[PDB]
Structure 1
């Protein structure tokens, strides 16, 4: 590591919509955000200048009840968002769009879906490339398992841009804990490698600790994932990403998240100090990334990071 370049720039973005949950993704060198607003609305927002602008509300297109699950898949030319209601068949609504502003409506359904027991949550991700096939993943985790049986994590995939979900991805997680709650399973597909970032409840300390597991390609459609250790004393793990083919991990000083730290390959460090709770990475390219949190209501501190190592 002869040459190491690190530089961060702080920017602020204001939003007129109070989002319960935030989902950020970049597309064609532009930052987007799927925002949930509770009449309940689901706005698609694009970042221009110093503020979020609302492009289109897609919840009004279906007229669901309550807050639905959101599965957004970003590709190089198209964006695909699925709104699934929170029976035996999964009822979703698949939206297609080559441009960011206008979306095509289409109601879909999955017969005898495998994720009836599993706890699923919202996330954005990109196609998972296996050989010459590209898959969209709807993943779930069983939120609790009293005694041992073993598909604790399983994803249903689609190689057709989300119209037929008949494909199944096996996730062999040998370290799934009995008698413990799992909360926020999201797949992290950097490059063409599958990874998972979820939460585990520690019943003796009463704390939700994040877990990160790397997956390898054992079989063509079956993966073997094991835990990756990012624990460091007196600091709570937050988010994980990859820059320069190296892990960049966000930490918090404590569970109050008064100040956030970012470590590059577990050696270099940057201290972020405004509450930075809810901060998440948005990878722009292989050497740039974003760090977005909301220190107060109606604003978003975005930290643009450049990391390099020759």
Structure 2
């Protein structure tokens, strides 16, 4: 009937990350770390006991501030998106693609009049959502009520 098991391992990180972001890829464990003067967006991997910086995606960008991050892990493919924090009317982002977790391939895109014009967003990892024979990745946002 019931089987429950618990183990504890420790990991140290070179980088004191402002925000951690965890994903499993090929049963390896990967992190998207964020330090912050000076800033980076490091793609890291746990080989046992320590994280290992594999990429800096911030470098390959014309990106002025701190972006929202939307990561998506299909089984074979990893797709990450760095989206500039508003505040125009359309939103630009830079995406990175791998099928291997080591070598991420640059790019840049723009969504004009994008649907989330006045929505607040925050970074997250996710999976494709099957909706009648189609896979969709979602970027979702919330209405701004608190006075600013």
Q: Distance in 2 between matches of 1:30 and 1:75?
A: 14
Instruction: Tell me how large the CA RMSD over aligned residues is.
Output: 1.4
1:143 positional shift: 2.9
Residues 1:15 and 1:81: Cα distance change in structure 2 (over 3 Å): same
Q: Distance in 2 between matches of 1:49 and 1:63?
A: 34
1:38 positional shift: 6.9
Q: Distance in 1 between matches of 2:38 and 2:129?
A: 35
Aligned residue number for residue 67 of structure 2: 68
Q: In the TM superposition, what whole-angstrom CA distance separates every residue of 1:181-221 from its partner, at most 9, and x where no partner exists?
A: xxxxxxxxxxxxxxxxxxxxxxxxxxxxxxxxxxxxxxxxx
1:63 positional shift: 3.3
Residues 1:22 and 1:48: Cα distance change in structure 2 (over 3 Å): same
The structure with the greater share of residues assigned to strand is 1
TM-score by length of 2: 0.93
Q: Find out whether 1:7 has 2:9 as its counterpart.
A: no
Q: Distance in 1 between matches of 2:37 and 2:3?
A: 43
Residues 1:21 and 1:145: Cα distance change in structure 2 (over 3 Å): closer
Q: In the TM superposition, what whole-angstrom CA distance separates every residue of 1:92-115 from its partner, at most 9, and x where no partner exists?
A: 011111111111111000011111
Q: In the TM superposition, what whole-angstrom CA distance separates every residue of 1:141-197 from its partner, at most 9, and x where no partner exists?
A: 113279xxxxxxxxxxxxxxxxxxxxxxxxxxxxxxxxxxxxxxxxxxxxxxxxxxx
Which structure 2 residue ranges, 5 or more long, are not aligned? none
Q: Distance in 2 between matches of 1:20 and 1:35?
A: 7
Residues 1:38 and 1:21: Cα distance change in structure 2 (over 3 Å): farther
Conserved 8 A contact 1:20-1:38: no
**SS at 1:60's partner residue?**
coil
Residues 1:18 and 1:145: Cα distance change in structure 2 (over 3 Å): closer
Q: Distance in 1 between matches of 2:3 and 2:37?
A: 43
Which structure 1 residue ranges, 5 or more long, are not aligned? 147-310
1:8 positional shift: 0.7
Aligned residues: 144
Q: In the TM superposition, what whole-angstrom CA distance separates every residue of 1:98-137 from its partner, at most 9, and x where no partner exists?
A: 1111111110000111112111100000100011100000
